[PDB]
Amino acid sequence: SMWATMEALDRPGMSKDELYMKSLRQSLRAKAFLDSSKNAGKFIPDEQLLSSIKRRDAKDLALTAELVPVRRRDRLQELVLLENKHRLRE
Amino acid sequence: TEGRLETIHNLRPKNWDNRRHWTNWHHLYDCEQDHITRESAPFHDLRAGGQF
Amino acid sequence: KNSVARTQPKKYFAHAPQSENLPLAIGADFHDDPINRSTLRKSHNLLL
Amino acid sequence: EQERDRAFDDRNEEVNYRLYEVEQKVAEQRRLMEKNGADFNRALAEQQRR
Amino acid sequence: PWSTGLATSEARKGAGLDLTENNLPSLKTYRKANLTQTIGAEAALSSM
Amino acid sequence: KLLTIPRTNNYYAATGGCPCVPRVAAHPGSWRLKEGQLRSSTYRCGTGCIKKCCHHSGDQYGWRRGPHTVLDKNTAATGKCD
Amino acid sequence: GIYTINHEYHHPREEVRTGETYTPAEMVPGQYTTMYNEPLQAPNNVIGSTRR
Amino acid sequence: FDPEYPVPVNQTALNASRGRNGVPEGDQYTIRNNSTREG
Amino acid sequence: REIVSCQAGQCGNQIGSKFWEVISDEHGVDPTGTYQGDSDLQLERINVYFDESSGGRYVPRAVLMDLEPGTMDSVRAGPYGQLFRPDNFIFGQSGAGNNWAKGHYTEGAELIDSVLDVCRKEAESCDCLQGFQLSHSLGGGTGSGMGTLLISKLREEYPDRIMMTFSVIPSPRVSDTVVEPYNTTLSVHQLVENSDESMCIDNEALYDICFRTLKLTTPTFGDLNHLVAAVMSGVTCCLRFPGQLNSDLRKLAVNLVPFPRLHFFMMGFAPLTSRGSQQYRGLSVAELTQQMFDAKNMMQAADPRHGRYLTASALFRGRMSTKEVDEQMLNVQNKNSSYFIEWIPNNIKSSICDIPPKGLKMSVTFIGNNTCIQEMFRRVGEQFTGMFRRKAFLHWYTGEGMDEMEFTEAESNMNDLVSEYQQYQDATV
Amino acid sequence: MREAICIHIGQAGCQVGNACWELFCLEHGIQPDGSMPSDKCIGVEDDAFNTFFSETGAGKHVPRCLFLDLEPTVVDEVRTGTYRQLFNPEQLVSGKEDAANNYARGHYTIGKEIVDLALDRIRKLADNCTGLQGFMVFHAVGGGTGSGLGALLLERLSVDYGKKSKLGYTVYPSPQVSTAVVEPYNCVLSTHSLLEHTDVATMLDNEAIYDLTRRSLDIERPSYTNVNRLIGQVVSSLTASLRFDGALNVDLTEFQTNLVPYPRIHFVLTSYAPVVSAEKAYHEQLSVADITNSVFEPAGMLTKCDPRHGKYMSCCLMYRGDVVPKDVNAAIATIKTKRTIQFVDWCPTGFKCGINYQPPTVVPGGDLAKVQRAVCMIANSTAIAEVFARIDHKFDLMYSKRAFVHWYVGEGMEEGEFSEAREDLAALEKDYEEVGAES
Amino acid sequence: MREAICIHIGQAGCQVGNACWELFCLEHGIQPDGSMPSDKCIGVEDDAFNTFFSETGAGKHVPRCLFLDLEPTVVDEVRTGTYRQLFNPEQLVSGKEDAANNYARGHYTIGKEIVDLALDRIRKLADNCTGLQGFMVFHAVGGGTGSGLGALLLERLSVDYGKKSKLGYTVYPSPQVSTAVVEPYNCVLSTHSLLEHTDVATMLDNEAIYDLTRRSLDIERPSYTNVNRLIGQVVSSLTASLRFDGALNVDLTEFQTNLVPYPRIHFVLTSYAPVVSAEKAYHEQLSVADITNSVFEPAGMLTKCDPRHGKYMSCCLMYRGDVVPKDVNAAIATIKTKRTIQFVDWCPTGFKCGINYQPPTVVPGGDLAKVQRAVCMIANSTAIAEVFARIDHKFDLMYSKRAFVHWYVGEGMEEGEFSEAREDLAALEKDYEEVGAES
Numbered sequence A: 001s002m003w004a005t006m007e008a009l010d011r012p013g014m015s016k017d018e019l020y021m022k023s024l025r026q027s028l029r030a031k032a033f034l035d036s037s038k039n040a041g042k043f044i045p046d047e048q049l050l051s052s053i054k055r056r057d058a059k060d061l062a063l064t065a066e067l068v069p070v071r072r073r074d075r076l077q078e079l080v081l082l083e084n085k086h087r088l089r090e
Numbered sequence B: 001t002e003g004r005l006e007t008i009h010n011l012r013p014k015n016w017d018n019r020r021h022w023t024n025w026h027h028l029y030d031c032e033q034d035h036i037t038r039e040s041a042p043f044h045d046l047r048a049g050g051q052f
Numbered sequence C: 001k002n003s004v005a006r007t008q009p010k011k012y013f014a015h016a017p018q019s020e021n022l023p024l025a026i027g028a029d030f031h032d033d034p035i036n037r038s039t040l041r042k043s044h045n046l047l048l
Numbered sequence D: 001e002q003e004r005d006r007a008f009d010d011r012n013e014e015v016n017y018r019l020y021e022v023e024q025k026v027a028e029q030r031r032l033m034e035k036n037g038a039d040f041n042r043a044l045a046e047q048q049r050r
Numbered sequence E: 001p002w003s004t005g006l007a008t009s010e011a012r013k014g015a016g017l018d019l020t021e022n023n024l025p026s027l028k029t030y031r032k033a034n035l036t037q038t039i040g041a042e043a044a045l046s047s048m
Numbered sequence F: 001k002l003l004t005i006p007r008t009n010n011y012y013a014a015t016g017g018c019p020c021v022p023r024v025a026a027h028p029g030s031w032r033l034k035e036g037q038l039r040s041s042t043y044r045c046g047t048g049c050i051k052k053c054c055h056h057s058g059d060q061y062g063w064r065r066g067p068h069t070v071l072d073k074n075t076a077a078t079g080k081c082d
Numbered sequence G: 001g002i003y004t005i006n007h008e009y010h011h012p013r014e015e016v017r018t019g020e021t022y023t024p025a026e027m028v029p030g031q032y033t034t035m036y037n038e039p040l041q042a043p044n045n046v047i048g049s050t051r052r
Numbered sequence H: 001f002d003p004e005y006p007v008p009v010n011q012t013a014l015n016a017s018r019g020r021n022g023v024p025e026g027d028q029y030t031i032r033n034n035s036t037r038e039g
Numbered sequence I: 001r002e003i004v005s006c007q008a009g010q011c012g013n014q015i016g017s018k019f020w021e022v023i024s025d026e027h028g029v030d031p032t033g034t035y036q037g038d039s040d041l042q043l044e045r046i047n048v049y050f051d052e053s054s055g056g057r058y059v060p061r062a063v064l065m066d067l068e069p070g071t072m073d074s075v076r077a078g079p080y081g082q083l084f085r086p087d088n089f090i091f092g093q094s095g096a097g098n099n100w101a102k103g104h105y106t107e108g109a110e111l112i113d114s115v116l117d118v119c120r121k122e123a124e125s126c127d128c129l130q131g132f133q134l135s136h137s138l139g140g141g142t143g144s145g146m147g148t149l150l151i152s153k154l155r156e157e158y159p160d161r162i163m164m165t166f167s168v169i170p171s172p173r174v175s176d177t178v179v180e181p182y183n184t185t186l187s188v189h190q191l192v193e194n195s196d197e198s199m200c201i202d203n204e205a206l207y208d209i210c211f212r213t214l215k216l217t218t219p220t221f222g223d224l225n226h227l228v229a230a231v232m233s234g235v236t237c238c239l240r241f242p243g244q245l246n247s248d249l250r251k252l253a254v255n256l257v258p259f260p261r262l263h264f265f266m267m268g269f270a271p272l273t274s275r276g277s278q279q280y281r282g283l284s285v286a287e288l289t290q291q292m293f294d295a296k297n298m299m300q301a302a303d304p305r306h307g308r309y310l311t312a313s314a315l316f317r318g319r320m321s322t323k324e325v326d327e328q329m330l331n332v333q334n335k336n337s338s339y340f341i342e343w344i345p346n347n348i349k350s351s352i353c354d355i356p357p358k359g360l361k362m363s364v365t366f367i368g369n370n371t372c373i374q375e376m377f378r379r380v381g382e383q384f385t386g387m388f389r390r391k392a393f394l395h396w397y398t399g400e401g402m403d404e405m406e407f408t409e410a411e412s413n414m415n416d417l418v419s420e421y422q423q424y425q426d427a428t429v
Numbered sequence J, K: 001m002r003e004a005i006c007i008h009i010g011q012a013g014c015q016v017g018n019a020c021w022e023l024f025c026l027e028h029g030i031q032p033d034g035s036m037p038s039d040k041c042i043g044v045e046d047d048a049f050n051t052f053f054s055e056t057g058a059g060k061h062v063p064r065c066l067f068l069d070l071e072p073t074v075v076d077e078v079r080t081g082t083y084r085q086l087f088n089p090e091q092l093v094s095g096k097e098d099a100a101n102n103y104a105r106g107h108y109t110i111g112k113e114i115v116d117l118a119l120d121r122i123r124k125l126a127d128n129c130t131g132l133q134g135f136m137v138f139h140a141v142g143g144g145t146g147s148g149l150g151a152l153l154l155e156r157l158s159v160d161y162g163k164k165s166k167l168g169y170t171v172y173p174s175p176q177v178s179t180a181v182v183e184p185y186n187c188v189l190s191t192h193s194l195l196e197h198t199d200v201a202t203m204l205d206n207e208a209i210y211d212l213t214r215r216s217l218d219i220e221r222p223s224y225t226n227v228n229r230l231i232g233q234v235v236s237s238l239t240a241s242l243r244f245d246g247a248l249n250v251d252l253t254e255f256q257t258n259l260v261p262y263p264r265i266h267f268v269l270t271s272y273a274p275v276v277s278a279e280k281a282y283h284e285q286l287s288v289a290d291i292t293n294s295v296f297e298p299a300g301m302l303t304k305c306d307p308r309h310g311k312y313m314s315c316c317l318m319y320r321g322d323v324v325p326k327d328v329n330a331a332i333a334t335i336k337t338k339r340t341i342q343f344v345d346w347c348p349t350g351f352k353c354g355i356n357y358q359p360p361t362v363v364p365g366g367d368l369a370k371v372q373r374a375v376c377m378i379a380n381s382t383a384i385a386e387v388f389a390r391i392d393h394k395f396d397l398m399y400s401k402r403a404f405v406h407w408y409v410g411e412g413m414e415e416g417e418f419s420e421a422r423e424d425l426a427a428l429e430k431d432y433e434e435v436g437a438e439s
């Protein structure tokens, strides 16, 4: 709150009018964040959340692929494991 | 006469001597240089006698 | 619902090119100058 | 052609100076109006002192 | 001479020469060009 | 920005003082009254020589604060607006 | 930030006159005629119109 | 707004780089010309 | 070929009053309406703007729209106020209150019945109607809201007519309301799909024309509106008078609009010079071209050097020659080709009319589809975003019944139009 | 058409209306008695007077205004004054007992039994009017009937007249000087109605008006008469756009919607210039730029609050006289550069302009010099929170000990009303601060 | 264009400004009423008065001046004097109590209750000038107001107007003639403003003017009126280049750049010749060479400092009348030839010349005599360090045992202010000697 912000921004020598200015700025930034989050559903496009969706999907797919093997990909990896020899000798 | 074929300095619009002309873009003719120097109209006050 | 006797006033604009025998060139609109207008008071012309 | 150009130029110049005359007349009318306003203000000053 | 060309030795314009619309070398100025309507509806009007 | 900031009762509650103008035992239109009522009159940038991202001011413009202290309960935390 | 000039040193000329009385319609020479009936250019004729 | 961009290209230089010298064989709208060289 | 004029709002009615001033002067019509022409030509195409009355006089085909009867009364008391037909004046008890919502949904909705009655009445009286010319201001309430309502709802009845709109745009420097972004955005995302062509005038540029060129000490709205009235007349000079190379509104739209959304134009007028400076300058087409392509002669407060020209049109008036008039256009295109779009060859369409404006040997009206027109749209869209982000001045528009999504729709359409104006500006071949 | 019904509440409102009418009659050519000259069939050739006066069944002009006072001294003075025949015998509502500087008395006991009669007179005025633009209320929040009865009248006007504009001009307690002890209570309680049941409220504090007269009009001992003359000049400047020909017409709805960003934020600070004495006037070239600078300067301010301590949100400048767009736009451009004045980030435009060709008029015996041009600002700015902070801090001091609350209880109001008034003023300061905050 | 604002501080400033403004009015044919009745020689609407007089709607020519003094004696007598109509009732503002030759009192206590209004009036004056050249501040540092309030005004003007020109016509305590006893304290304490916020500080001490007038004008009894008339003549000679036409026109910054070699080496002595009596004048042929030599002599100089003890750094000559540039060229040649005056080695040219067509205007009833040509020299030279090295010696003698320091420290000024001013002045003599030293 107000007292908490004044305690947090305890900078000596600095003008305490400027202290009130900064505390007001933080408090109203928090209030504006709350107000904007109440109605951001309509304003924010769906494409914005796509980045976070992709990050979560990549993490989940990594966690799943860390365990499950596939024989169809096993044939592919048997085809692989020699082209890498080709690359290192080349 | 801001740019001139008369002088040595090329004050012409950038790459006007090899501009987008009917002689080179989809067409192509050996008359490309002749047609650029012939259709550079406002730099023809002197060479053309002022005609288009 | 005003007076029925009253009529639409006539507003005389002092200097107009048509009245002065001059063309209506750009910058020659001296009749639209408020000082050249007889009365600055505004009437209800349509309702009268 | 040259005669027509010169004729238009002379007539335009005459009309331009007539326009300048009427513009200066209205400017002088405004100047006289604010002179009279200043005189009114001065008279009101003496009246307020009185 | 051209308008931009030198008029130093250009022929002087005679005093009797008329440099107006009526002396423009046009069909209306051509002497044996019979512009008045001899035959037609406009001729019938002119005959009234 | 120190002029942008409003001189709200919230400001006085957090700062210490009241929007009530200071009542000073002074003759009207005097230097003593002006120093008692305005904070731009007694402003002084620093103390002595500096030896014994630059410095900026803008807090001395306003009025001196009253002797009373604004209780928090008289102040609203939120206000209805958009 | 805008240049201004006094009327005393910026005004049209009073030293030029033609002694011609003309309505603004007749002011501009040939200003009510086309290029098919009158292709060429020539001045008008008004009261007091002389060679200039 | 940068007046220079977009930069006007050189069609002569573009043809020289692309090798756009001609079609001696001829196309649907072109002509089999023996005079043209390097294509 | 018939053009029906509609003047919306205070600004629109004043501009129309002075437009009918200049048109009556050009067609030899006195304030009482009687014809005092000096040749056949004035009467031969007087039907274009004037419907013939009974006793040999003429009545303008103009519809005056204003929820405030004040500007109505000022127009009527004007020197040519008696020229207009009485029932063509339409007004209400209370004004729009500088609100687009009030002018477009609540206060302008009752009078729109009579306004459409009058416009339709003036529609069949035309042998072959060419279009509707509406003059209004985007920042107002009645001129913006009610005017754009008329623009939107006349296209449905008359899709094949040219819809020409003189929009007097706002400017932050010229801000004389506080809801300019809201009003002009609500007007523009309607004019985009409901106007065949929309030319924009900025009061900043009008003031600057008075400052630089006219050098008038005290120029009022009369002198200010003469500048735009001259161009309004010079667009249809080719309609009203014969010329060597004729054009109409449809031909102007065809030669000026490459893509239908891009139909916003910035205009200029020539010749323009202070009275004392007219002696040093010779009046010819060579000087007229320089005056057009001089940016200080624009009625748009945007610099043509800050964009490219999609298209341009010069409606020349006055007796001239067709050779050097095209020579000037070729020269300017070639030597400012960095400011003309390459893939649109010969960006400038020049039309020639024989009859010049009264008192001028030769004049011209410039209509340019410059890509710099995106500058105003981007600036006022940024202002609109700043106001709508913190929900400023919404309650006036919202309590009139309007939805929150309308402003977002307008913002999207504005950013979209700026997007074409940029992506065709920087486009390659 | 374009009528605007004027309302005067309390002694302050009634005297301000008297000084407004001595100006309106003189400006529109109506005699103080109201009748026409005997030889003339019609007193005034035009109907520019229509907005303030309605012609009668004898040809003479009765004003489109109501006076309203719970005590009979001021209204009886109006009856016995030089305008005894101009004003209607009705529309001059008088009570037999005042409100005694008590909002509860003016709102709940004495006000309720006279407010309906006042609304009957107002309804007759509105029926007479055919193009009513709105209501033009004048009063003082520091009085009994001015605050409580004015509040009740505004509430009834809001419920009965729809969304019709209700402009208000109210005299607030001064930061320094006051003529009452319960004035903070009255102002705090009146801010309820003035915060919900009015469109735009105008600060008219007597301390700043006195300072204006002293420093500029050179009146060493000014009075309520001079103060009300200045107020009438401001009101005439605001209203003259619909009465006289002008470049940029501005109406009541126009400048009430171009002024307020939020329904709660509608309290505006107003200034008028060039306010100069006759001796001052012929010494200065009162140009458009000079008068604009004087208006934006706190010296020309009519409210004892410094706008430099807040942020401007919407300024409506009404220019009168020989002003020109050649100069007003230049003055605006050069005043936006000045950094004492400063706008909220969410309102970049922030300016409305209304130009009228009619210069201000001169009242006999008045101290206003004849000026070729004038300009009045109606400015909504966040700096107005200062006076609210001061007034409700005085309210808190007076309310901690429950002082003078017994008078309000005896005149019929709950103490919860005091509590809610204080809470709503605190909320008003909070959202003033919020809208002053940046994005 | 070319406007210049004159600010007079203290009694000495007001006394100087009275003579300056009467002489300006006589230059421009402006009566104390402030009008131009009829002048055949004056062209139609000719404006060479724009630098010092601003046109008014009343046709008046209001001076661009601001008179200040903390007590109303001189202010009131000017307000009731001859130029009541010429001078605005404002722009001529006064306090109520004098500074009493207390720099601390005039800079911290009594100066601050009027400096705000001083800045307001200066801003009002500057808003009317579209080509403001700069500010000329006339004061004597030996007093209370002129030192303290003058320093405060200069410090505030520096931040209010940026890099605009400041020309401080300052009357230092002369080596022998000096009124006050705390005058050395005031002069030393006011050194920071003159070092930093004044772009060029011109010397106008009284003893040198007294010697000049007694030896050259041949009047046994001149007065403050006479010395102020001479000072006004000097100021008019300086401003004639930007007022009237001339062969070589020089502006404030034009001679600032040529006269100030180093950031604070800007304290410059003044001289003027031919100063001549009525009987003296019409018997001599005052050649340009003769008047230039009289200027460079140390007896026709307005500052009591002998140039032979220092190095000349840069001399700016202002010639008025029928002077041909060859005469001044020969004067420069013979000045460089003659040895008893020596220029500093690193400044070869060291000379600026400005010729103005209009000759000086005699003031009958005063003391001067009509002369066909005149010249005023403003000289930056290292010899000016002597007056500083004398005033600081007096300051040290006075301050060794804390004499007269309680008055200063009781007005809200720290004790260290005296030490800071003394150290700054000492650095002034130090770098004067440094720049005077040969390479």
Ligand SMILES: Nc1nc2c(ncn2[C@@H]2O[C@H](COP(=O)(O)OP(=O)(O)OP(=O)(O)O)[C@@H](O)[C@H]2O)c(=O)[nH]1
Pocket (backbone or CB within 6 Å): J009, J010, J011, J012, J013, J015, J016, J071, J098, J099, J100, J101, J102, J140, J142, J143, J144, J145, J146, J147, J171, J172, J178, J179, J180, J204, J206, J224, J225, J227, J228, J231
């Ligand atoms: N500007 C101005 N303010 C006035 C005037 N008369 C009274 N006031 C203000 O009103 C306050 C006094 O209370 P009133 O408004 O007279 O009270 P009231 O409206 O008559 O209501 P009651 O107190 O019940 O009689 C003073 O503090 C003034 O600020 C006036 O003539 N002009």
Ligand SMILES: Nc1nc2c(ncn2[C@@H]2O[C@H](COP(=O)(O)OP(=O)(O)OP(=O)(O)O)[C@@H](O)[C@H]2O)c(=O)[nH]1
Pocket (backbone or CB within 6 Å): K009, K010, K011, K012, K013, K015, K016, K069, K070, K098, K099, K100, K101, K140, K141, K142, K143, K144, K145, K146, K147, K171, K172, K173, K178, K179, K180, K204, K206, K224, K225, K227, K228, K231
């Ligand atoms: N040249 C000139 N100097 C003057 C004149 N009057 C006063 N002085 C100077 O003023 C000095 C005395 O300072 P003060 O008597 O305090 O006057 P002040 O500097 O204006 O300061 P205060 O009057 O105390 O407010 C003297 O040494 C003079 O040099 C004058 O008329 N002409």
Ligand SMILES: Nc1nc2c(ncn2[C@@H]2O[C@H](COP(=O)(O)OP(=O)(O)O)[C@@H](O)[C@H]2O)c(=O)[nH]1
Pocket (backbone or CB within 6 Å): I008, I009, I010, I011, I014, I015, I096, I098, I099, I137, I138, I139, I140, I141, I142, I143, I144, I168, I169, I170, I176, I203, I206, I221, I224, I225, J247, J248
């Ligand atoms: N050029 C010009 N513009 C005007 C005139 N009057 C108003 N405007 C413009 O119109 C805009 C405001 O329109 P407004 O009067 O509110 O229209 P309304 O609400 O429909 O009556 C402003 O931005 C002005 O710049 C005028 O006489 N001439």
Ligand SMILES: [Mg+2]
Pocket (backbone or CB within 6 Å): J010, J011, J071, J098
């Ligand atoms: Mg009372």
Ligand SMILES: [Mg+2]
Pocket (backbone or CB within 6 Å): K010, K011, K069, K070, K071, K098, K099, K145
């Ligand atoms: Mg003194």
Ligand SMILES: [Zn+2]
Pocket (backbone or CB within 6 Å): F017, F018, F019, F020, F066, F067, F068, F069, J393
């Ligand atoms: Zn308090």
